[PDB]
C-alpha cells in the first residue's frame, strides 16, 4: 500500500547507487516480519555492486543466521555466478561483499560453499576466487572441519579439490573422523581409471606435508599404494619421500 | 563421593561446551545472568578490582546463584579451552577468563551428583 511507494523509491535508488548514506528503511530490513516481500520489491537483481556489498554488510550485522543463510542462497550466489561467467573476474565491491559474508561463517558455509560445490556446475575460476576468499578469512576450527567433512563426503569434481587444498592450507588441528573421511576419499581414487588433474595431486601433497604426524601405518601404506596405482612423474616422488620421512603420533 | 569437585567442574564445562551453554568473560556473563537463563557463576580469586568481586557476589545473592571461586584466571582459561592447540595439542594462546557462567547442563550421572552434593554440603 503506502509502504510500496517508499520501497519502490529506494528500489530506484539502489539501481543507481554508488556510495553515500543509505535510506534508513533499508537498514531495518532484517527487523521486519515479511522481509522476503520487501526484498522482492527492492529487486535485488537490479542492485549495483556497492549497494549489494552494503546490503550484505547490513544482513550480516543483524544476526539471525537463517535469514542470512537464505539471503546468501537466493541473492548473492546467483549474482556471483552470473558475474564470473560474464566478466571472467570478480568485482572489488562483490569481493568485499563475500568477505563481509564470511564475517558470519555459519551462514556462509551452508549458503555459498556447500551449494556451489554441491551444484556440480562450479567452474575453475569460481573455485579459485572463492577458495582464495576462504584463504583470506580466518575461520573457526570446528566450522572448517565440518566443511572439510562435508566436502570429503560429496562427489568429486575438479573444483572440489581446490577448496579442499585451500582449507588444508589453513593448517589447523583436525578432528580424526575428518581425517578418516579424507583418507577414505583418496582411497576412493584407488581404482579410478579417470586421469586426475594436477590439483588433486597438489591437494594430496599438501595433506602429506601438513598431516603426516597424524597418519597411522595402515593408511600410510594405503596412500603408498595410491601413489603406486596413480603415479605422476614429478609430484609422486615428493609425496613418497614425505611419507617415508614422517613420524606418527 | 567418588570423584572430586575439581574434575566434575571441568566435566560440567565440557558438557556445556558441546551443548553451547557457556557465558565467558564479562558482558555475556553478566547480561545473560540477569535474563534468568543462566544457572551457575564461577569467579577467579586472583583479581585486580575488588568491586568486581562485590558485583559478582551481589549478582549471585540477588538471584540465589551459587558462587564457585577458583584461584587464578589463567588456569580457568586452561580448564575452559580458550587455547589454540597444535596437531599434538600444545597451547600457545594463553587467555584467562574471569566470569564463567553456566547456562545449560549436560545430563550427567557422575559430575552432576558430585556438584549437587557439594551444593547441598555448602548450603
Amino acid at each position: 500500500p503506502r509502504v510500496l511507494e517508499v520501497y519502490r523509491g529506494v528500489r530506484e535508488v539502489l539501481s543507481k547507487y554508488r556510495s553515500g548514506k543509505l535510506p534508513k528503511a533499508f537498514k531495518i530490513i532484517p527487523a521486519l516480519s515479511n522481509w522476503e516481500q520487501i526484498l522482492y520489491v527492492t529487486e535485488p537483481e537490479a542492485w549495483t555492486a556497492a549497494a549489494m556489498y552494503q546490503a550484505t554488510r547490513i544482513f550480516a550485522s543483524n544476526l539471525k543466521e537463517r535469514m542470512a543463510q537464505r539471503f546468501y542462497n537466493l541473492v548473492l550466489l546467483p549474482r556471483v555466478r552470473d558475474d564470473v561467467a560474464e566478466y571472467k573476474r570478480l568485482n572489488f565491491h562483490l569481493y568485499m561483499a563475500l568477505k563481509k559474508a564470511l564475517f558470519k561463517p555459519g551462514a556462509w558455509f551452508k549458503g555459498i560453499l556447500i551449494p556451489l560445490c554441491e551444484s556440480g556446475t562450479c567452474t575453475l575460476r569460481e573455485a579459485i576466487i572463492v577458495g582464495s576468499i576462504i584463504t583470506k578469512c580466518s575461520i573457526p576450527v570446528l566450522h572448517s572441519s565440518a566443511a572439510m567433512l562435508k566436502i570429503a563426503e560429496m562427489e568429486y569434481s575438479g573444483a572440489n579439490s581446490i577448496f579442499l587444498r585451500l582449507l588444508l592450507d589453513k593448517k589447523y588441528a583436525l578432528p580424526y573422523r575428518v581425517l578418516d573421511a579424507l583418507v577414505f576419499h583418496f582411497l576412493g581414487f584407488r581404482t579410478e581409471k579417470r586421469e586426475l588433474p594436477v590439483l588433486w595431486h597438489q591437494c594430496l601433497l599438501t595433506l602429506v606435508q601438513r598431516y603426516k604426524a597424524d597418519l597411522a601405518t595402515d593408511q600410510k601404506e594405503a596412500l603408498l599404494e595410491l601413489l603406486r596405482l596413480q603415479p605422476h612423474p614429478q609430484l609422486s616422488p615428493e609425496i613418497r619421500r614425505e611419507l617415508q620421512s614422517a613420524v606418527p603420533r | 563421593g567418588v570423584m572430586d569437585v575439581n574434575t566434575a567442574l571441568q566435566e560440567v564445562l565440557k558438557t556445556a561446551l558441546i551443548h553451547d551453554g557457556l557465558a565467558r568473560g564479562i558482558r555475556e556473563a553478566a547480561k545473560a545472568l540477569d535474563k534468568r537463563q543462566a544457572h551457575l557463576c564461577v569467579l577467579a580469586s586472583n583479581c585486580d578490582e575488588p568491586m568486581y568481586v562485590k558485583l559478582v557476589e551481589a549478582l549471585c545473592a540477588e538471584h540465589q546463584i551459587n558462587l564457585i571461586k577458583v584461584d587464578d584466571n589463567k588456569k580457568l582459561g586452561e580448564w575452559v579451552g580458550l587455547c589454540k592447540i597444535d596437531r599434538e595439542g600444545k597451547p600457545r594462546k594463553v587467555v584467562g577468563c574471569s566470569c564463567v557462567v553456566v547456562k545449560d547442563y549436560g545430563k550427567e550421572s557422575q559430575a552432576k551428583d558430585v556438584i549437587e552434593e557439594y551444593f547441598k554440603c555448602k548450603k
Binding site: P175, F184, D214, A216, Q219, R249 | G89
Partner: peptide, 18 residues
C-alpha cells in the same frame, strides 16, 4: 563413518556436526 580409526593418544574436542 569410516573403518580405520585414530586409535591412540587423546581426543581434545568432540566436535559438533549434528
Amino acid at each position: 563413518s569410516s573403518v580405520m580409526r585414530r586409535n591412540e593418544q587423546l581426543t581434545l574436542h568432540d566436535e559438533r556436526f549434528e
